[PDB]
Amino acid sequence: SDPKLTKAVDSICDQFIVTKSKISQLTEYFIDCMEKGLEPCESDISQNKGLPMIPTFVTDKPSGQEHGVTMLAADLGGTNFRVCSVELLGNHEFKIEQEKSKIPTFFFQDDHHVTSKDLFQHMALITHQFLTKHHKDVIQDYKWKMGFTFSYPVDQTSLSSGKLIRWTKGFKIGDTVGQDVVQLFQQELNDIGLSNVHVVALTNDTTGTLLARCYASSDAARAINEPVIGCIFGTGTNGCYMEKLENIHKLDPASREELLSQGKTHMCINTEWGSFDNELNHLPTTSYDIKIDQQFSTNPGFHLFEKRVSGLYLGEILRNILLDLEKQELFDLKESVLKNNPFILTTETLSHIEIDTVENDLQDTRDALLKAADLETTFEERVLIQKLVRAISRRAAFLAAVPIAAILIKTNALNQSYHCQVEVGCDGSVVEHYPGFRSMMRHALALSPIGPEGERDVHLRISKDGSGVGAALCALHANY
Amino acid sequence: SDPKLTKAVDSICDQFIVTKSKISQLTEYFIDCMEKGLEPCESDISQNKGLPMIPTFVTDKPSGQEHGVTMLAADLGGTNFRVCSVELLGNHEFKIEQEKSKIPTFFFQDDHHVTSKDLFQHMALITHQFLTKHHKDVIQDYKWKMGFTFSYPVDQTSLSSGKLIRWTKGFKIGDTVGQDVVQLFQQELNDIGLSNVHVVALTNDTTGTLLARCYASSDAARAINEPVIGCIFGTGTNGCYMEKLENIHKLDPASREELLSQGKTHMCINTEWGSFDNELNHLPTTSYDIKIDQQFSTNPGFHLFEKRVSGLYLGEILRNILLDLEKQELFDLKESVLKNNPFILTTETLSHIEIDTVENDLQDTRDALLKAADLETTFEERVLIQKLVRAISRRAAFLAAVPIAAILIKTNALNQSYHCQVEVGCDGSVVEHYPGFRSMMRHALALSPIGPEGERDVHLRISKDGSGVGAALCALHANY
Ligand SMILES: OC[C@H]1O[C@H](O)[C@@H](O)[C@@H](O)[C@@H]1O
Ligand SMILES: OC[C@H]1O[C@H](O)[C@@H](O)[C@@H](O)[C@@H]1O
């Protein structure tokens, strides 16, 4: 027991407190940023520091009765790449064949040069392998339609076109920025004899999450649970929603009028809320967050909301806290390997600490810290490390509720029919598996302007779109 | 169209309102009735008018790692009888084969005499039919153990013995009352060559629901979701919970000390909360409820809470309201068959009205009323019937939350570790399929003394396991 270490920890934990008044302020500011982000910016989209609010050119929420021939789907995340074939049977049913593979660490390192051709050649070959394994009998001329789920910010110009704005989540491929990722992918498919495979749709992982949940939600569930948000809380964080065409002022007025005359009323918006308040006008900030953004992040000055929320960064926050406590001569790092190893403490490490119990002398915390960075600890040190972890995760979960509450308020989403609630489709390892993260998001929602009664009308449902149904639904609509 | 009918309906709807203060009163009173009911009744158990609080002789919550050879299970409800075989694989997994069949209307007509042998012979033959279909090769050669789920109040004397206290729901076989239902069932199994099938456990459907959730709940979910209540909202309503052995004063002190010395701390209590406040000291009561209890129910003076909540009675409430409005010359029943047909309006009929919409001129309500009792309606009449239905169902759901809040408060269930929440295993057609019932129960929980913060820690989870797994777990434990 070191009373000076205990007070230092309690003081740092206080730096992560998010009050009811703060949530209200951030919710209000988020809506302002939404409206600003819906206006056209005559600057560079890569220079823009506001809330991107990217039109996805998706205008229809699936009913569940969509059906068609087998579609192809490719899904590039922050960790895995998947190729799938999806047969939409209507009636909320589908057949899926998929192959999942980790993204090689080769694409995340700077010691050797990585090019766009490396990435998209790798993706085209995986596609070729999938088609050889699961659809060998299909003619080599078959007119495959493919939907491409690309979980990165894209300057979407149509359903099938858009240029990469900037990488995130540790990806470092310099020459992809400013390039149309559908063309890059299509060219590599062409080069290996798969020119008959046409990438006809491009969706963000938020967009796919919303569409897939709209299609799969049964008639009974859909009756009293209306999916209004598809969002992600994993390596990164983001969410989408349906905005009135009239409010999407950055959209060409002729395109708006054309869509309106076709009977459309809304278009899905990829908010890219990981980049909420990149200027830090209001986001809770500690010295540890600044250090992560400026020194250890791949995109300094951008995606600052994500750096306080998503799983890529929560462990790194703890590392910088322990390093600061060592400089203060309060914590003995012993023979650990924390120093000079950014991101060696993972959110997976924290997940073993969050609900560890003192009845077992916090043995899971000890093992996790030894396994991660060879950090020996005493019981008393683990008690304080647990406090730090819980403050980090609570702030992350409280902030995670802000974009959702803001969207629900701006769109008046809680105004529905009798008994009908709003469903927020959630995917990602943090919201799904980090113990207590969902419970704290719900607490924060109850504290937000929607109040406890609004939170009861909100269903944070784990809804995974890892099978490519979201991309498949977009490809089904598009023309070959 | 008729302002006098509209004001009469609004006035009737106001009679079904349950206020926050009322919920608080009923929640407090329920706890008092729990403590009274845990004492010896000092009278006949069949004469007892208090909260039964029946000890089930189940003292251990499954861990999920139980495993063994295939067990048999039989489940007699108020509508169906099902036989199944359950293979417990450990690791929260199991294989189940089951056959469901309606209870013949022969057992529902008093026009001819029905005996216990009729019922249990029918059950034994269905069991034989199940074994012939799914286990033909070893029907007569296996020493089968069977768990018996009997969804009726039983004066349980051990895990495998208990006498029927009284029938509920649409059942009445006089010679079963006071008889050990395990012996009645076992005797009929013996008579058809199934003496090798041993009924070794007897559980209420509430008890089985809790056990099944304890076994099926994954390690991760179980870590932050402790199942504390198994409850039913179907034809009837009821729930069970784990009570400290020291508080079960009606239990023989020698048995309590024996169990305690064996390391046991709790026993599951079948509350039979359908019989909460049979004297109507506080329960909301209308003339329609009194008419149902005194004239149309099989058990007048008992199960009065159930008669305001469960699916057997909600439709019958609407029938008595429409009959009252006709006597007043305010509602035209036309050529309907409502009069002199108790229970012809079902909760299934009401489920089609609850979220029917005026955008479709309430056509589903029109069809449901014609199909149920040949009641033609105008749009205005359907609008008012919908108001009545919604007032009936809201009262049912608000009352349904009272026993749950009371149990959680009495047992200090919300006092747990960090992030740990309580799970309430729910089964039955009403909570599962009646639109909005679960949402209204959650509102009522937020209004109860546990408050909105308590409701967020409560998860009303629909039991996708059933009472067969619960009975199978008890059979696995018992000796052949
Ligand atoms: O994957 C979640 C989220 O992570 C980052 O914020 C970006 O790459 C987004 O495009 C993506 O939606
Ligand atoms: O089936 C739910 C419930 O219905 C009635 O209340 C009784 O028969 C109970 O024994 C039973 O648990």
| DSSP reduced 3-state for A183 | helix
The span from the CA of A231 to the CA of A164, in Å, is 20
* Distance from the B199 Cα atom to the nearest Cα atom in chain A, whole angstroms: 38
Cβ-defined contact of B417 to A443 (cutoff 8 Å): no
Name the residue of A76, A151, A206 to mutate for ligand 1: max ligand atoms within 8 A of Cβ: A151
Q: Does B138 touch chain A (CB under 8 A)?
A: no
**What torsion, rounded to 10 degrees, do the Cα atoms B397, B403, B405, B408 define?**
-140
Whether residue A478 contacts residue A143, with contact meaning beta carbons closer than 8 Å, is answered with: no
Q: CA–CA separation, A244 vs B3, rounded Å?
A: 40
Span from the CA of A233 to the centroid of ligand 1 (angstroms): 9
Name every residue whose Cβ is closer than 8 Å to that of residue A72 and which is 6 or more positions away in sequence. Answer: A83, A84, A85, A86, A127, A144, A145, A146, A147, A197, A468, A472, A475
3-state secondary structure B376-405: CCCHHHHHHHHHHHHHHHHHHHHHHHHHHH
Query: CB of B236 closer than 6 A to ligand 2?
Result: yes
Nearest ligand, CA A299 = 1
Candidates A292, A205, A275, A258; CA nearest to A470 is A205
Q: Using a 6 Å cutoff on CB, does residue A153 contact ligand 1? A: yes
Distance CA B269, CA B256 (A): 14
Residue B306, ligand 2, Cβ within 6 A? yes
CA distance B281 to B274: 15
Please tell me what resolution, in angstroms, this structure has: 2.3
Q: Say if ligand 1 is within 6 A of residue A429 CB.
A: no
- C-alpha A14: how far from its chain's center? 27
Q: How far apart are CA A415 and CA A442, in angstroms?
A: 19
Cβ burial of A108 (10 Å; 0-12, 13-18, 19+) is middle
Per DSSP, which regions of B31-158 are E strands?
54-55, 71-76, 80-90, 93-102, 144-150, 154-158
Select from A355, A420, A446 the Cβ nearest to the Cβ of B452. A446
In 3D, which of A109, A81, A88, A79 has the Cα closest to residue A348? Answer: A79
The full length of chain A comes to 480
The experimental method, as deposited, was: X-ray
Nearest to B419 among A224, A436, A452 (CB): A436
CA distance B82 to B80: 6
Q: A348: part of which helix (H) or strand (E)?
A: helix A347-354
Q: A355–B421: do the CB atoms touch at under 8 Å? A: no
Distance A205 CA to ligand 1 centre (A): 7
The kind and range of the H/E element at A202 are strand A197-203
Residues 6+ apart with CB under 8 A from A256: A245, A246, A248
What ranges make up the beta strands (E) of A373-457?
421-427
Please work out whether the CB of residue A205 comes within 6 Å of at least one atom of ligand 1: yes
Q: Is B456 close to A439, i.e. CB distance below 8 A?
A: yes
Residue tagged active-site, from A155, A166, A175, A361: A166
The phi and psi torsions of A347 (rounded to 5 degrees) equal -65, -25
B 375-394 residues with CB below 8 A of A?
390
For residues B471 and B169, give the distance between their C-alpha atoms in angstroms, rounded to a whole number: 22
* C-alpha–C-alpha distance, residues B131 and B133, integer Å: 5
Structural domains present in chain B: 71-207 (3.30.420.40)
Report the Cα A324 to chain-centroid distance in Å.
29
Tokens of B238: 């009821």
- How far does residue B70's CA lie from ligand 2's centre (Å)? 27
Length of chain B: 480
Is residue A465 a known part of a binding site? yes
- Contact state of B435 with A224 under an 8 Å Cβ cutoff: yes
Dist. CA A197–CA B445, nearest whole Å: 54
CB under 8 Å to A230, separation ≥6 — which residues?
A206, A207, A208, A209, A210, A211, A212, A213, A239, A240, A425, A463, A465
